Amino acid sequence: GLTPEQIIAVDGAHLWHPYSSIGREAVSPVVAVAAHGAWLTLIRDGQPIEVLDAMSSWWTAIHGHGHPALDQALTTQLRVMNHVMFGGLTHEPAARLAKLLVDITPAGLDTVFFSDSGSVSVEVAAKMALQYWRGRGLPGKRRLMTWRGGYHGDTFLAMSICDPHGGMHSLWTDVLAAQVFAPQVPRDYDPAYSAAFEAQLAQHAGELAAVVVEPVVQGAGGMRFHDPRYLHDLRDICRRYEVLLIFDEIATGFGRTGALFAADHAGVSPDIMCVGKALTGGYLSLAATLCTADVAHTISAGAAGALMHGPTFMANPLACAVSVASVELLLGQDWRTRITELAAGLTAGLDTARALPAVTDVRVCGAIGVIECDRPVDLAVATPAALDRGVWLRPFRNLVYAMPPYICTPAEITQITSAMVEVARLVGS
């Protein structure tokens, strides 16, 4: 047991944080002591305070924290089987989850590879695509193509398709694989961007295993939205040039953008698809890669005879059990109305920010609201300002944004957006 000052002291000396230093942190982390529903209990000046988790703890807590259906599923599975190795064994929570995932994902995705994080599931997708083409006698098809502004994780193959500027690729000269980058995909649809994407793809087709993109919403690389018709063009280009299509739905999955999967906004099925952040409802680390029967059978008939990947905790019974409950909980309610109501609350609550002087754009897509500013947001100002108004907000670069839990009441959504407007206002003064 540690007091908050003991925690801060341990943390300052021994704990790395995401994309952080040791010893050169401008602002200390805030101690978290509880989380229930949409609310975090944080320690501010020795005093516990309840604030709204407007970030859904980094896209994860779609049902809020400590939801009874998900707590219950965890403890139930813990009573019977915490974990067993997946090599040579199978179990009910894997079979239930996989049956769920093949049924609700874009059509044709019929096999499920479980792993422990989004980055790994992206590497697994790349491995599927590479082994698929080696199973076709075309080992030269080993590069990847994407469009700028994307983010696909932090392991070294995942990095190679992240936005070169956003992903600081200048720091990894002669280290990252050299992939093919198309220009930033625009917000509005423009058949000339698609024509130039195809023209660029056409000169790399024989060395391309796959096109890899986030569908409709690009997260960590800029919180940018783009017209779903672009994904329809990508599906057509990939079909005609025989390059596999891979959708990274690790951020967009499970209703977050107003459709169950963001690919549903275009009616597109990728050959391969990754899911992750909201898969467990924010309880535990879990991720999944799905492919079509065609990909699976080509890999399985190739010279390797198998997919050469196998995480230690593959298909962990506990993680799968809570994921089964989170997915069932979501499908058991009218999630699309819920998301629509969240979107309209974000849109209504954020409109006033458009007239703020340092604000260049406001945009909402499903349960995602973005205030885009004209200068980088100072976290040392923004974070305590939002805590002062009862909201946990985490700006990044010039963006003040929220992806709040689906269980947020309309009054709670208005409290979130109000704190976002006031952060935006402080930015410009």
Q: Which stretch binds ligand 6SR (CB under 6 A): 107-115, 119-127, 307-315, 381-389?
A: 307-315
What is the smallest separation between the CB atom of 245 and a copy of itself, expressed in angstroms? Answer: 20
State the residues that interact with ligand PLP by CB under 6 A. 117-119, 122, 151-153, 214, 219-220, 248, 250-251, 276-277, 311-312
Q: How far is CA 169 from CA 121, 166, 201, in A?
A: 21, 8, 22
178 binds a copy of itself (CB under 8 A): no
Amino acid at 219: G
- Could you give the CA distance from residue 336 to residue 236 in angstroms, rounded to a whole number? 28
Q: Of residues 71, 190, 236, 341, which one binds a copy of itself by CB under 8 A?
A: 71
Query: In the Cβ-directed half-sphere of 199, how many Cα atoms lie within 13 Å?
Result: 7
58 binds ligand 6SR (CB under 6 A): yes
253 has binding-site annotation: no
Distance of CA 288 to the CA centre of its chain: 12
- Could you give the CA distance from residue 78 to residue 73 in angstroms, rounded to a whole number? 9
- Which of ligand 6SR, a copy of itself, ligand PLP, none binds 279 (CB below 5-8 Å, type-dependent)? none
220 binds ligand 6SR (CB under 6 A): yes
Mark 133-152 with x for binding to ligand 6SR (rule: CB under 6 A) and - for no binding: ------------------x-
Element of type H or E holding 218: strand 217-218
372 binds a copy of itself (CB under 8 A): no
74 binds a copy of itself (CB under 8 A): yes
What is the smallest separation between the CB atom of 306 and a copy of itself, expressed in angstroms? Answer: 5
Q: Which residue's Cβ lies closest to ligand PLP? A: 118
Q: Of residues 183, 206, 305, 310, which one binds ligand 6SR by CB under 6 A?
A: 310
- Could you give the CA distance from residue 69 to residue 321 in angstroms, rounded to a whole number? 11
Beta strands in 224-332 (DSSP E): 224-225, 244-248, 272-275, 287-292
- Which of ligand 6SR, ligand PLP, a copy of itself, none binds 77 (CB below 5-8 Å, type-dependent)? none
Beta carbons of 223 and 301 less than 8 angstroms apart: no
Just list the catalytic residues.
19, 151, 248, 277
In the chain the first and final C-alpha atoms are separated, in Å, by 42
CB 322: neighbour CB atoms within 10 A?
Answer: 30
45 binds a copy of itself (CB under 8 A): no
Beta carbons of 261 and 251 less than 8 angstroms apart: no
- Could you give the CA distance from residue 248 to residue 244 in angstroms, rounded to a whole number? 13
Paired strand residues for 392: 53
* Residues near ligand 6SR (CB under 6 A), total: 16
Q: Closer to ligand 6SR at the Cβ: 160 or 326?
A: 160
Beta carbons of 74 and 321 less than 8 angstroms apart: yes
- Which of a copy of itself, ligand 6SR, ligand PLP, none binds 221 (CB below 5-8 Å, type-dependent)? ligand 6SR
Q: Which of residues 100-159 bind a copy of itself (CB under 8 A)?
A: 102, 110-120, 123, 126-127, 130-131, 134, 139, 142, 153-157
Kindly state the tokens that stand for 78.
């813990």
Q: Which of residues 150-169 bind ligand 6SR (CB under 6 A)?
A: 151, 162-163, 166-167
What is the smallest separation between the CB atom of 118 and ligand PLP, expressed in angstroms? Answer: 2
With tokens 């779609």, the residue in question is 62
87 binds ligand 6SR (CB under 6 A): yes
The values of phi and psi at residue 370, to 5°, are -125, 130
- Could you give the CA distance from residue 251 to residue 279 in angstroms, rounded to a whole number? 10
Element of type H or E holding 229: helix 229-241
Chain contacts with ligand 6SR (rule: CB under 6 A): 18-19, 58, 85-87, 151, 162-163, 166-167, 220-221, 310, 312, 314
Residue numbering of the annotated binding site for pyridoxal 5'-phosphate? 118-119, 248, 311-312
